[PDB]
Amino acid sequence: NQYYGTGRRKSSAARVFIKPGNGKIVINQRSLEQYFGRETARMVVRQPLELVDMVEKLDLYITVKGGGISGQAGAIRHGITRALMEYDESLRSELRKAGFVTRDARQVERKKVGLRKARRRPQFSKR
Amino acid sequence: PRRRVIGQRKILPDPKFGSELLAKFVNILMVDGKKSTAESIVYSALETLAQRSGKSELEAFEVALENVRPTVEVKSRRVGGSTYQVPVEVRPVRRNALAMRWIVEAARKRGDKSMALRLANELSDAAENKGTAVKKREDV
Amino acid sequence: GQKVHPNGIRLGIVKPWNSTWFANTKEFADNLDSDFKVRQYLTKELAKASVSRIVIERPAKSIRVTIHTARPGIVIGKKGEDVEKLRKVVADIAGVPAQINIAEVRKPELDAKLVADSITSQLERRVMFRRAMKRAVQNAMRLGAKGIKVEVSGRLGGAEIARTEWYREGRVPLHTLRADIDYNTSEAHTTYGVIGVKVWIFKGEILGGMA
Amino acid sequence: AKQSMKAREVKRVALADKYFAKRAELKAIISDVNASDEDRWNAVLKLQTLPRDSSPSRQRNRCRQTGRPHGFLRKFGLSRIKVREAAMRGEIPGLKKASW
Amino acid sequence: VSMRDMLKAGVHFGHQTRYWNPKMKPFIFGARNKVHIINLEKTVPMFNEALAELNKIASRKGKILFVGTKRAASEAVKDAALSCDQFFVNHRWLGGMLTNWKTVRQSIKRLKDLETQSQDGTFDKLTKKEALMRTRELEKLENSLGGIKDMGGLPDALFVIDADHEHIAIKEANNLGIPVFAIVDTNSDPDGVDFVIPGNDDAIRAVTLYLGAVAATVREGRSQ
Amino acid sequence: PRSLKKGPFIDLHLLKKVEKAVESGDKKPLRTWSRRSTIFPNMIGLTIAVHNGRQHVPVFVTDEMVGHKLGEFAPTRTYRGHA
Amino acid sequence: NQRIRIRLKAFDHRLIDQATAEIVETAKRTGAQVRGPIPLPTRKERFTVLISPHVNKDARDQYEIRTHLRLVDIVEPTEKTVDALMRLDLAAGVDVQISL
Amino acid sequence: ARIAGINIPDHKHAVIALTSIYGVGKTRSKAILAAAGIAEDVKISELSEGQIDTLRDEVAKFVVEGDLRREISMSIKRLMDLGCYRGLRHRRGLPVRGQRTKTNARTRKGPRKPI
RNA sequence: CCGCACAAGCGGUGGAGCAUGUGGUUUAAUUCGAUGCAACGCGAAGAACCUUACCUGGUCUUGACAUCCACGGAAGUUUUCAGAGAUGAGAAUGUGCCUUCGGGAACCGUGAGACAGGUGCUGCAUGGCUGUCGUCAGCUCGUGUUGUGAAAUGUUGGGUUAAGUCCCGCAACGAGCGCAACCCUUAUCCUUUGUUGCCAGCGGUCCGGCCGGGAACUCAAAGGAGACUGCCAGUGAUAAACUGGAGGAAGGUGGGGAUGACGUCAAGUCAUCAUGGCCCUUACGACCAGGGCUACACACGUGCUACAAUGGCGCAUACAAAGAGAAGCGACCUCGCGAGAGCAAGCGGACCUCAUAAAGUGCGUCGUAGUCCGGAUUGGAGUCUGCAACUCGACUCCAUGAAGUCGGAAUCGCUAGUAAUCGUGGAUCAGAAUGCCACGGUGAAUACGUUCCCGG
Ligand SMILES: [Mg+2]
Ligand SMILES: [Mg+2]
Ligand SMILES: [Mg+2]
Ligand SMILES: [Mg+2]
Ligand SMILES: [Mg+2]
Ligand SMILES: [Mg+2]
Ligand SMILES: [Mg+2]
Ligand SMILES: [Mg+2]
Ligand SMILES: [Mg+2]
Ligand SMILES: [Mg+2]
Ligand SMILES: [Mg+2]
Ligand SMILES: [Mg+2]
Ligand SMILES: [Mg+2]
Ligand SMILES: [Mg+2]
Ligand SMILES: [Mg+2]
Ligand SMILES: [Mg+2]
Ligand SMILES: [Mg+2]
Ligand SMILES: [Mg+2]
Ligand SMILES: [Mg+2]
Ligand SMILES: [Mg+2]
Ligand SMILES: [Mg+2]
Ligand SMILES: [Mg+2]
Ligand SMILES: [Mg+2]
Ligand SMILES: [Mg+2]
Ligand SMILES: [Mg+2]
Ligand SMILES: [Mg+2]
Ligand SMILES: [Mg+2]
Ligand SMILES: [Mg+2]
Ligand SMILES: [Mg+2]
Ligand SMILES: [Mg+2]
Ligand SMILES: [Mg+2]
Ligand SMILES: [Mg+2]
Ligand SMILES: [Mg+2]
Ligand SMILES: [Mg+2]
Ligand SMILES: [Mg+2]
Ligand SMILES: [Mg+2]
Ligand SMILES: [Mg+2]
Ligand SMILES: [Mg+2]
Ligand SMILES: [Mg+2]
Ligand SMILES: [Mg+2]
Ligand SMILES: [Mg+2]
Ligand SMILES: [Mg+2]
Ligand SMILES: [Zn+2]
């Protein structure tokens, strides 16, 4: 038996496999802390298990690529949420109330002509 | 604005302590999007505060802030076609925001060897009601 | 308030291109130059034949040219006597074997270009401009039963100060992209200078894509 | 662009084409690491004698249609103006306004 | 229809004395409770003559148009007309119905065009929103023109519930010269009604009596 | 500047002129337009009239100038002060 | 054993898919064994030019060219197949490359 | 500690200290330390006298301060008297290697004064 | 009745050095155009020669560039002298090809004219193209209707919107150009195909998806599905519409782009090109070398880097996107402190190369200083492109360490993946990006409100 989830955030994407186990996790063949110096990312990724108190019952195998550390973290969180819904759909209601189910769509905006940044324009001459 | 008005934006709770107020604090302290630097500074300052001033960390922070919160300001409205320098009671959100802004602005000035140290000193004084954010309240 | 080119926007939506040959960077620029020379020749020779458009292809190292005119007989000649000369000369300048095909424009009134060239000719013969506009427009409405607009500007009637007048009938929904707007312009020289002419001819709505 | 300009350009391209090989060989000699000093000296001296316009560097791209010396694109060999109008005609295969 | 039936139906009601209308005094029954009253015995002969005229018109297959703009009467006029297969207006009277019918013809054309698309079901070709949009537009057109889409031209004669509230239709009728059969009441002028039907224009029971009598007259006359 | 693998640079015609002059001992100035050539030691004691866009400027060569470009001793712009 | 690999490029996606349609149906009716048409990432160039004869720095437009790719692989080049697929020809707009 | 004639390096990382010598940048400073075989980060204090002596001998290899200044002066004087373009723009106190002068020459021209 | 118009917030400009444009001055020359906004990193997506239109000097006169006639010779190749070069003078040389067998086609030279040539003038003679009000919500017609007419209604009124968007009322009913929609792009799922892309479950492995194998997953690119106030509650004149809630990847134009109504400014461009017409033909046309467009008491606009411990320096170690490549991109290995050099594989490119992202994180150090901040300027010594880097290129090493410690009056930008901050790619291009056009990483604050400034 096994269950799967796919997550995305900014330019990143992640594949998540979840299985009954004592709670060990690996990301790109590295431990979570080895893959993330910043202390925030670790909760950011573990919050779904905390929310349903599953932390010690499922083992995780993770592969992720694209985007930065923050985007990856978000992608993994989303993937874990989906994986959990596959495992037990009754979790859907509380997972949505937590806001974990929603696909954040915010992405960078393209530069435009005459603007040295998206919505940034040179100082007025004031003549 | 002329056509419309809208509510303020939601923010996450602090991931270490679960308080949104502390997250707002780190945001006002943040510069150039270096959030990790700001949060390291804030965590170290609160840690040294708890071990040297007060009994507990988040509680020490909250009491130091409470010793400072302004209630009233004179910032203007003009509906009559002429400017009002009218004293008006302040919403709690703005109370906290003004207090936080003032304390960080003072820490920038205090001038100790490091920002975590400046911040801890200002905050310890604020818990002692001597942190000059009290003065920034009092002048208003 | 300058407007965009009606044909350009609708390319790849309802309008197909006039040149559909593939090439790589090592050949693109000179392919384009050869196409330019070919058209620049054919227009000069076929001025009298009332030619509308020329579409060029380069399949299998050979150039194939298709011409749309309102009256083939003038260009095709007796027993293909003269078209053969065109084939030879285009083969020469293109540097490849050449193939020519003729398509017959059936309603010259509803062709933007032909209308414009008629107007330019009439102007060059000092026919009063607005009369020509009126007759052109009314003919368009009689046959095509869909909107038309005409624009003329320059030193009209030899007036000291140049100016522009224009005329419309029916729907001309430019901002719409489904609209099968036919657009073109033409030129007329006079003793006084240049008088431009532009024409739009709506012909209905396309639903289901150019496919 | 005055006719003289395009005349100069065509003359440069032709003449430069002519002496391509000889210049290449003498460059090979001049740059060689182990060449005798006297040989390199002679080669350098002799290079001067060739017509200056022989060097490819002196050429300037100009619009095929008009010969404008600015706003050139190698892809089409045309200036920013003529390429734009020709595009609007739709004579360039597969070119379309970009909205991404 | 007789005088006491009319009284029971409230045909004799009028309006409370109101300013500046001494024109109606001739033939006023009277007044009570500060409201004027109509003479039903003028009505009986006039009303019967109106019905006789309508019977004659129906016998020659005249196209009666039933216009009701007085609120309560709009659905009743629709019922009466459709019972008779006749055309009707049950909304605000669009000014220029007759004088500007030239324009109305095009609305009829486009109504039928969209209806034909409906039978075709080709709205499915469109993007979902535009399909719904065309459907809604068709719904509005049906709502407005449904009662006249089959009329095909200017009608022969007009039935009017109340001169006091359809007065624009009276103006157009006079302009073109189309006979008007209408209820005429206190606070209303017989001017512009060719075959006046004296009687109260307000009471819904009176309206019911009028409409029943008129529809019966139409079908009896066209059936002789 | 010029690579050392390349070696110094000089225009041929100038070389022939200076060689002929020095072997002849004519010792009178040499009109030239070659601002871009480099001074070799054997040219010491000569005089070169170097074109400056307008006029050929006399110049007397001495050992300190060896290795300099000829043009470096003939200013092309003029200036005497805005005021 | 042998294997034929064919790469197709064009600017009209529909046109090139049609091309693949003919190629594959011929490979079938001739009885060869085929790997299905594999799409490959499509390149797109973009250009921009000032639209005004007398310049306004702000005023410029943008254009792009899209070139699509399809790939087909034949792992059973039966003899009659080999020549047959060189008997086929495609529209002008389609560029074909075959290799063994 | 006194080195290279009259220099008295302050007590800091030996490298930062030595740079004080006019003519000794960071690179030369590391070179000297490496040659002397001394750790770069030791204070200028707690050197034995012999260690400072080996450092004196080390620095004796490079051009001492006074002769370095003299050689700079002689080079510039040679350019000045040679009368070449670079000498002219030295004597006129203007940028010497091709910078624009319609603007942006204050470091060479000095602070602004009215025309 | 509204808008980053003000207010509320954040960060800059105005002081310093330097890059760049303009004005003035200067010069033989500093070629020309552009001027409130809506000129000033602007035409120019790239001036050492060339470019180049300016200056000095040296040369040609049917001509550099095109047709027409005559005459003479294939062409072309190699090479010598004079001259800065343009050119001039010579040498050998070629000596050919179709030839109906006449010659001709080829080219090249001289002569004769008709003509060539012009970045010369007029954007107030014009076409074409573009900016501006302004992505502002308006601009009009037909039929009908009212006034003796000049005209008016529609298009005003009460609501409601981003909107002349929609509902009600209403002497008006409609229509057209605008608005919205149809197009590209992004957010979720489904179908199809699986190499050069993919590796969940299997077998082997030196542990390298490395290879046997797999068609799951990511991803690739074609076609589908999906959001409409559809559902619920309240509100409202039962109107439209508004407020909240459910579900859902996404909720009320989901987000961004393209798309610019009638007209205003005799706005800009005769130097892209086209053209009316006026002017110059041994010269206002043409060729060549050197100079200049880069000057310098000045001052104005737009930028880049700083004045530092939220930092500087040393060591170790993570995570992208989007592009380009055939005279091209160029690995590997060897040499140099370094820019680089030698050798040389691969790839027309999901395969090969450019090319290891920086902020980040771990360790140490510096201790508030004109500093282990800052880097301008100058001396010495080198590499690379190019015939050639003096005027006048970029880059490397050593040495040298200005001014500058948060900046007046006053003023500019920004409402969310935005501001701020950190890197990568591309065009022009032998060489020459602090400019321009794109790509991603991290990632905020504030908005009472409309009165004042401002503009519909
Ligand atoms: Mg919800
Ligand atoms: Mg436009
Ligand atoms: Mg060049
Ligand atoms: Mg040097
Ligand atoms: Mg700009
Ligand atoms: Mg309005
Ligand atoms: Mg403000
Ligand atoms: Mg400044
Ligand atoms: Mg100043
Ligand atoms: Mg100028
Ligand atoms: Mg010579
Ligand atoms: Mg002659
Ligand atoms: Mg002229
Ligand atoms: Mg002007
Ligand atoms: Mg103008
Ligand atoms: Mg003007
Ligand atoms: Mg209006
Ligand atoms: Mg709008
Ligand atoms: Mg509308
Ligand atoms: Mg109305
Ligand atoms: Mg295995
Ligand atoms: Mg599959
Ligand atoms: Mg799709
Ligand atoms: Mg929607
Ligand atoms: Mg909701
Ligand atoms: Mg949109
Ligand atoms: Mg959308
Ligand atoms: Mg639109
Ligand atoms: Mg001019
Ligand atoms: Mg020159
Ligand atoms: Mg300039
Ligand atoms: Mg430093
Ligand atoms: Mg990478
Ligand atoms: Mg490049
Ligand atoms: Mg090495
Ligand atoms: Mg590529
Ligand atoms: Mg690179
Ligand atoms: Mg670091
Ligand atoms: Mg140094
Ligand atoms: Mg200082
Ligand atoms: Mg940057
Ligand atoms: Mg960014
Ligand atoms: Zn009544």
Side-chain angles (χ1 to χ4, degrees):
Chain A
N1 64 42
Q2 189 156 240
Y3 320 93
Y4 178 77
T6 307
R8 318 184 198 100
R9 179 67 170 111
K10 266 172 166 177
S11 69
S12 75
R15 314 156 63 244
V16 176
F17 294 87
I18 71 77
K19 62 180 68 180
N22 68 266
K24 86 186 68 75
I25 74 185
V26 63
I27 313 187
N28 303 4
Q29 317 311 93
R30 277 173 276 180
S31 77
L32 164 67
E33 46 278 1
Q34 288 176 301
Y35 203 87
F36 293 97
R38 285 176 71 174
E39 293 177 350
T40 59
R42 306 182 193 160
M43 292 74 68
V44 175
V45 302
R46 295 176 295 189
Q47 335 181 47
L49 290 295
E50 300 287 358
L51 187 282
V52 299
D53 285 13
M54 279 306 236
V55 181
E56 293 177 350
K57 266 70 67 165
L58 289 323
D59 287 354
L60 304 182
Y61 174 76
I62 313 292
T63 66
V64 55
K65 60 168 58 74
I69 73 168
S70 189
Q72 290 164 359
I76 313 145
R77 192 191 70 188
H78 187 216
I80 298 161
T81 301
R82 287 168 152 211
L84 291 166
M85 254 172 303
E86 320 331 311
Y87 180 5
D88 179 1
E89 76 304 317
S90 68
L91 308 177
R92 172 160 260 272
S93 184
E94 55 289 57
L95 293 169
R96 186 168 266 279
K97 285 198 291 270
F100 295 162
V101 177
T102 203
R103 170 68 159 102
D104 188 346
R106 300 173 295 162
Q107 300 169 343
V108 63
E109 286 341 287
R110 59 161 288 188
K111 188 191 167 302
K112 306 186 180 78
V113 194
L115 279 35
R116 67 165 164 253
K117 308 173 71 214
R119 311 197 190 187
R120 185 62 153 88
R121 56 186 176 85
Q123 179 175 4
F124 180 42
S125 60
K126 196 177 54 185
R127 317 311 299 183
Chain B
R2 291 199 182 281
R3 180 58 68 99
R4 65 182 181 88
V5 169
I6 294 169
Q8 304 309 135
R9 192 176 295 90
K10 173 264 179 171
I11 69 163
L12 78 175
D14 173 280
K16 183 171 174 178
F17 301 105
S19 56
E20 303 86 347
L21 177 63
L22 185 57
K24 179 65 70 179
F25 197 63
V26 300
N27 285 4
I28 290 61
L29 194 136
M30 183 175 70
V31 181
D32 294 314
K34 291 202 177 197
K35 186 172 284 187
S36 63
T37 306
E39 79 194 351
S40 74
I41 291 165
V42 169
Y43 289 180
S44 60
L46 293 199
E47 183 76 85
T48 191
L49 181 89
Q51 293 177 335
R52 92 192 183 146
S53 304
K55 62 178 294 290
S56 305
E57 186 169 3
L58 180 58
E59 297 69 27
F61 169 68
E62 285 178 340
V63 69
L65 186 68
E66 285 163 28
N67 294 164
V68 160
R69 285 178 181 152
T71 56
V72 64
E73 70 190 329
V74 304
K75 291 197 65 66
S76 191
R77 293 92 189 246
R78 322 170 49 121
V79 185
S82 298
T83 310
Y84 312 154
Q85 271 66 27
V86 55
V88 291
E89 177 264 16
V90 179
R91 301 277 56 61
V93 179
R94 186 166 171 82
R95 298 193 62 207
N96 285 286
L98 288 171
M100 296 162 83
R101 191 190 302 167
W102 290 340
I103 166 177
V104 305
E105 197 285 321
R108 279 164 163 55
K109 177 59 193 72
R110 187 175 188 122
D112 309 313
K113 284 297 200 293
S114 177
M115 206 33 153
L117 179 59
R118 269 110 61 183
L119 175 59
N121 291 332
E122 278 308 312
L123 193 64
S124 287
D125 293 356
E128 296 167 32
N129 192 31
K130 274 68 183 172
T132 193
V134 302
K135 189 57 163 63
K136 296 166 190 283
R137 174 175 69 199
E138 212 66 25
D139 289 345
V140 176
Chain C
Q2 304 61 250
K3 303 56 168 167
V4 72
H5 198 292
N7 227 48
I9 307 291
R10 298 169 180 73
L11 281 159
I13 327 178
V14 296
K15 300 302 197 191
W17 294 261
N18 294 308
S19 324
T20 81
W21 53 260
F22 195 107
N24 307 90
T25 298
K26 299 182 72 167
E27 169 178 330
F28 217 95
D30 37 7
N31 280 2
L32 294 166
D33 195 25
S34 307
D35 298 13
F36 166 83
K37 288 177 185 291
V38 169
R39 289 192 177 93
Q40 182 262 27
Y41 172 74
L42 286 167
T43 198
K44 191 66 71 67
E45 314 315 290
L46 305 194
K48 306 306 302 291
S50 59
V51 58
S52 67
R53 70 185 294 226
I54 309 154
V55 307
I56 329 178
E57 314 174 325
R58 319 178 154 297
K61 300 296 85 181
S62 76
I63 202 172
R64 187 172 57 208
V65 186
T66 313
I67 306 184
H68 302 69
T69 85
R71 55 183 179 194
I74 306 305
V75 56
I76 204 156
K78 293 179 179 179
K79 208 71 65 175
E81 177 275 338
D82 62 348
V83 56
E84 177 51 28
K85 314 173 191 182
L86 308 175
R87 191 210 63 71
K88 298 183 196 305
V89 68
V90 305
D92 289 345
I93 76 182
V96 295
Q99 182 34 245
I100 328 289
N101 299 321
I102 320 289
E104 195 170 42
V105 179
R106 210 150 308 84
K107 314 179 178 176
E109 312 68 7
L110 317 175
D111 163 341
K113 197 158 213 316
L114 304 175
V115 167
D117 325 292
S118 188
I119 295 160
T120 61
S121 84
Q122 289 164 272
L123 262 293
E124 278 173 348
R125 294 190 292 101
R126 293 182 183 174
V127 180
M128 294 300 293
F129 65 87
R130 71 178 72 265
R131 194 186 311 293
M133 301 193 353
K134 319 322 291 193
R135 64 174 58 248
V137 171
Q138 69 189 3
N139 306 312
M141 305 288 345
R142 285 189 303 100
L143 299 324
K146 211 64 58 175
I148 178 161
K149 181 185 169 190
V150 181
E151 183 178 2
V152 181
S153 191
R155 293 180 71 185
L156 317 189
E160 193 65 13
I161 304 162
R163 81 177 183 281
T164 168
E165 305 47 27
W166 68 268
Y167 193 57
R168 177 169 57 235
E169 281 284 23
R171 307 193 44 61
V172 197
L174 301 180
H175 277 54
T176 313
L177 308 173
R178 293 171 179 167
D180 72 350
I181 300 294
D182 190 22
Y183 172 83
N184 227 309
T185 81
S186 202
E187 202 56 87
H189 310 71
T190 80
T191 321
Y192 323 121
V194 190
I195 321 174
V197 181
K198 332 178 190 177
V199 182
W200 315 252
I201 320 173
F202 192 42
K203 322 184 177 182
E205 221 64 34
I206 325 302
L207 314 169
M210 42 199 327
Chain D
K2 319 194 289 185
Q3 299 302 89
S4 58
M5 272 327 120
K6 320 160 198 170
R8 291 173 187 185
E9 166 128 41
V10 74
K11 184 166 73 80
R12 276 158 195 162
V13 55
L15 189 153
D17 162 343
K18 198 183 84 85
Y19 298 108
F20 173 69
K22 183 169 71 172
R23 286 186 85 93
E25 310 338 308
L26 200 70
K27 287 279 193 169
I29 313 306
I30 295 167
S31 150
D32 155 35
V33 63
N34 54 26
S36 173
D37 65 9
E38 161 41 1
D39 314 350
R40 265 177 273 145
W41 180 249
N42 308 156
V44 160
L45 283 163
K46 185 266 286 178
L47 206 76
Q48 314 180 14
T49 78
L50 309 190
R52 312 188 89 182
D53 262 343
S54 64
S55 56
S57 77
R58 287 170 81 88
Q59 311 173 115
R60 195 97 193 217
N61 307 292
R62 308 177 164 281
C63 183
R64 287 180 184 227
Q65 310 302 339
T66 72
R68 199 179 187 264
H70 288 300
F72 186 69
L73 287 56
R74 302 168 190 217
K75 187 56 144 287
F76 321 124
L78 312 166
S79 71
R80 63 179 181 77
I81 301 173
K82 290 294 184 181
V83 66
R84 192 223 171 188
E85 46 214 281
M88 293 183 284
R89 311 257 173 52
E91 301 158 20
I92 311 165
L95 185 297
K96 175 169 31 44
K97 296 205 71 168
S99 70
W100 74 81
Chain E
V1 188
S2 191
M3 178 280 285
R4 304 289 209 151
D5 320 326
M6 285 216 255
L7 197 95
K8 184 272 294 190
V11 177
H12 60 285
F13 306 157
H15 300 256
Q16 52 182 357
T17 189
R18 293 162 188 181
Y19 63 89
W20 182 88
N21 192 354
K23 308 177 299 177
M24 318 313 170
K25 299 180 180 180
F27 302 150
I28 63 180
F29 177 80
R32 68 181 189 171
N33 308 334
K34 209 182 294 179
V35 179
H36 303 310
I37 299 294
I38 308 160
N39 193 293
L40 301 175
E41 315 59 17
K42 292 287 184 179
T43 304
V44 173
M46 272 332 317
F47 186 21
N48 297 348
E49 293 165 12
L51 300 185
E53 191 66 17
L54 286 161
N55 184 311
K56 182 179 176 182
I57 301 157
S59 81
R60 63 178 180 81
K61 309 182 184 71
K63 300 189 303 186
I64 319 302
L65 177 59
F66 289 72
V67 57
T69 81
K70 203 171 197 166
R71 293 182 183 174
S74 61
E75 70 82 37
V77 294
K78 171 260 292 190
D79 186 17
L82 83 83
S83 79
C84 270
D85 313 325
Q86 292 309 127
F87 321 110
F88 63 94
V89 173
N90 65 327
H91 302 291
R92 176 182 67 103
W93 179 265
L94 300 189
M97 294 300 293
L98 320 182
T99 70
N100 193 22
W101 165 272
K102 179 179 173 66
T103 304
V104 181
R105 289 162 61 195
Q106 303 48 18
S107 76
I108 307 313
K109 304 295 95 172
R110 291 189 291 164
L111 171 79
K112 292 174 183 186
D113 296 345
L114 293 175
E115 187 54 30
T116 308
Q117 293 177 335
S118 309
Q119 291 73 64
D120 296 338
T122 53
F123 301 127
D124 74 0
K125 177 62 214 86
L126 286 291
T127 296
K128 198 173 182 172
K129 190 183 295 180
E130 299 92 306
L132 178 60
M133 183 176 282
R134 294 288 77 77
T135 305
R136 293 174 169 178
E137 179 174 14
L138 176 56
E139 295 166 20
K140 295 184 183 176
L141 272 305
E142 283 281 26
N143 299 339
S144 59
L145 311 168
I148 71 160
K149 66 184 176 181
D150 307 325
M151 198 159 69
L154 307 172
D156 301 334
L158 311 181
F159 175 80
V160 158
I161 293 285
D162 182 20
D164 199 31
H165 180 334
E166 283 88 59
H167 91 84
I168 300 293
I170 291 61
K171 293 179 179 179
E172 294 198 67
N174 304 336
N175 188 342
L176 283 296
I178 316 297
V180 185
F181 305 73
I183 320 300
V184 175
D185 189 337
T186 69
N187 197 17
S188 69
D189 42 352
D191 308 25
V193 189
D194 307 76
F195 279 77
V196 62
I197 305 180
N200 181 265
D201 52 38
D202 315 285
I204 294 174
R205 291 312 92 220
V207 169
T208 307
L209 187 61
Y210 313 142
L211 291 168
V214 168
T217 299
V218 172
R219 286 173 275 101
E220 88 187 15
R222 194 167 56 212
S223 66
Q224 189 69 6
Chain F
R2 196 168 191 71
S3 290
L4 273 296
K5 296 173 284 288
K6 190 67 69 68
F9 179 99
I10 183 168
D11 283 349
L12 177 48
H13 57 269
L14 171 59
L15 176 43
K16 311 299 260 312
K17 296 163 87 85
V18 60
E19 188 284 330
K20 184 184 298 184
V22 73
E23 70 66 7
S24 73
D26 55 3
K27 184 185 193 301
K28 281 326 324 305
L30 295 75
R31 301 168 65 268
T32 189
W33 293 267
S34 188
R35 289 177 66 85
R36 71 189 192 153
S37 59
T38 296
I39 299 174
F40 291 101
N42 62 283
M43 296 189 333
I44 290 164
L46 310 182
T47 63
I48 323 295
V50 186
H51 190 244
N52 78 342
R54 278 165 45 172
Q55 199 284 315
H56 294 77
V57 175
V59 176
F60 173 71
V61 184
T62 66
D63 41 339
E64 313 56 14
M65 306 189 225
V66 177
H68 293 239
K69 297 289 197 172
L70 274 298
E72 204 185 279
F73 305 93
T76 73
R77 302 193 184 77
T78 319
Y79 187 83
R80 331 177 206 85
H82 286 306
Chain G
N1 221 324
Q2 301 189 343
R3 179 276 297 288
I4 326 294
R5 195 162 281 192
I6 319 88
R7 293 172 67 227
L8 305 164
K9 300 192 291 175
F11 316 142
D12 178 337
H13 76 284
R14 198 177 301 97
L15 181 64
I16 188 171
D17 325 287
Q18 286 165 11
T20 70
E22 303 61 64
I23 297 296
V24 73
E25 293 177 350
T26 50
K28 300 332 324 174
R29 73 175 183 72
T30 191
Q33 293 177 335
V34 188
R35 310 301 295 143
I38 295 158
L40 298 173
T42 80
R43 175 184 193 170
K44 62 180 68 180
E45 281 65 338
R46 292 178 174 142
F47 318 84
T48 188
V49 278
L50 297 173
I51 46 72
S52 60
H54 196 263
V55 72
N56 292 326
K57 196 54 186 177
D58 303 356
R60 71 194 60 182
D61 58 7
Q62 311 209 182
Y63 306 92
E64 97 161 18
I65 304 170
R66 294 160 97 129
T67 180
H68 318 263
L69 257 298
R70 308 291 178 266
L71 181 147
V72 179
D73 188 319
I74 319 292
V75 300
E76 174 33 48
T78 311
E79 164 26 68
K80 162 23 55 178
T81 315
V82 173
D83 36 358
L85 300 323
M86 282 70 89
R87 301 300 72 80
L88 295 174
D89 298 32
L90 295 309
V94 182
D95 164 332
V96 188
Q97 201 310 309
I98 315 172
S99 196
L100 173 48
Chain H
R2 177 171 162 196
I3 305 181
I6 294 283
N7 268 322
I8 42 165
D10 80 21
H11 302 275
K12 287 183 319 191
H13 285 211
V15 165
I16 322 294
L18 192 73
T19 58
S20 305
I21 298 175
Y22 180 83
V24 181
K26 185 92 151 83
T27 311
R28 285 186 188 268
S29 186
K30 302 166 171 298
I32 293 287
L33 260 280
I38 293 165
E40 77 313 1
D41 63 349
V42 306
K43 296 266 279 188
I44 294 295
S45 54
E46 329 78 34
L47 286 321
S48 77
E49 158 32 62
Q51 286 166 334
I52 307 174
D53 216 22
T54 182
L55 295 166
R56 288 175 195 103
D57 324 303
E58 281 303 319
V59 302
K61 305 209 325 323
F62 301 136
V63 187
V64 68
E65 300 197 325
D67 316 319
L68 181 58
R69 296 177 193 281
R70 210 179 308 102
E71 159 289 341
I72 291 163
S73 75
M74 305 342 305
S75 72
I76 297 173
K77 183 68 180 295
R78 194 186 79 97
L79 290 168
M80 296 267 314
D81 74 60
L82 185 66
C84 77
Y85 173 83
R86 182 147 71 123
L88 281 317
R89 295 193 75 90
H90 271 289
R91 64 173 78 154
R92 285 199 288 152
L94 308 155
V96 185
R97 55 194 69 189
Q99 304 98 314
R100 74 200 291 138
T101 63
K102 195 174 188 173
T103 59
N104 288 22
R106 302 326 305 193
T107 297
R108 191 67 174 146
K109 290 178 66 174
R112 289 177 210 78
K113 62 180 180 295
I115 62 178

